[PDB]
């Protein structure tokens, strides 16, 4: 029975809600688990970026967010073709591909091509056979300055 002047409210506690209570004492141990599983990942991919592959410049949809720029899923196939990148050689040298991304616009298309000219110029590539150099691989000294990049590779600022 309601007392006086006071808010009308409908508490969602009419089910057997106590059985399905998720308590967050996992949280401080989870952040230790997620961190050790993130360092030991980065220590495996020893000169590669720790965040992993480059993501494209991508506009947010639906008019609330459409002035902002994200990291998308991966580069469109009309962004890889114009960059001279093969769609299946892309994944292997650390370039994100999705076959889904359309291109309704030229500036958002051209934004992600200049994005990839940066990457391939920034790309240090180690020979598969180390003690015999191959052509497309970068110079001896560029393998010797080679360090990981902690953080998202070419980070996206609006």
């Amino acid at each position: 029975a309601p007392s006086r002047n006071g808010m009308i409210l409908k508490p969602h506690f009419h089910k057997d809600w106590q059985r399905r209570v998720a308590t967050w004492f996992n949280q401080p141990a989870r952040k230790i688990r997620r961190r050790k599983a993130r360092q030991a990942r980065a220590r495996r991919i020893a000169p590669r970026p720790a965040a992993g592959p480059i993501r494209p410049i991508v506009r947010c949809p639906t008019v609330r967010y459409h002035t902002k720029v994200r990291a998308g899923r991966g580069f469109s196939l009309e962004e890889l073709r114009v960059a001279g990148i093969h769609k299946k050689v892309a994944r292997t040298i650390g370039i994100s591909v999705d076959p889904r991304r359309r291109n309704k616009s030229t500036e958002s298309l051209q934004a992600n091509v200049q994005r990839l000219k940066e990457y391939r110029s920034k790309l240090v590539l180690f020979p598969r056979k180390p003690s015999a150099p191959k052509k497309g691989d970068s110079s001896a000294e560029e393998l010797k300055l080679a360090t990981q990049l902690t953080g998202p590779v070419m980070p996206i600022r609006n």
């Binding site: 299946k88 240090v124 590539l125 598969r128 990049l149």
Partner: protein, 122 residues
Amino acid sequence: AKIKARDLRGKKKEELLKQLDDLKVELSQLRVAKVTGGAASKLSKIRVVRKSIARVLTVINQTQKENLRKFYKGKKYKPLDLRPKKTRAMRRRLNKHEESLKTKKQQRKERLYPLRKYAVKA
């Protein structure tokens, strides 16, 4: 007497049966002494004779199996006792070579496009 396994494992097949039944008789001369109720020293002995029959029958059962898996080793089928008793679910898994079987097409995708050792410049 102190009977060991080290000296039984380098003996002939027929002698261990005679060494067994010589203890079977010796054990059956003490199970009488237990019921008659005489000589307390002939009751502490009875555990020495029981555990030593367990030695003689073991060295028999041991070397009668290391002979089987010496003859049956170079055979495609071998008896279920001589097969590896790893867990039931572990036996149902694929072979070491059956997991090494990739497709002819996945030996082309992984051929042309090997996962490259690369870095970037900060």
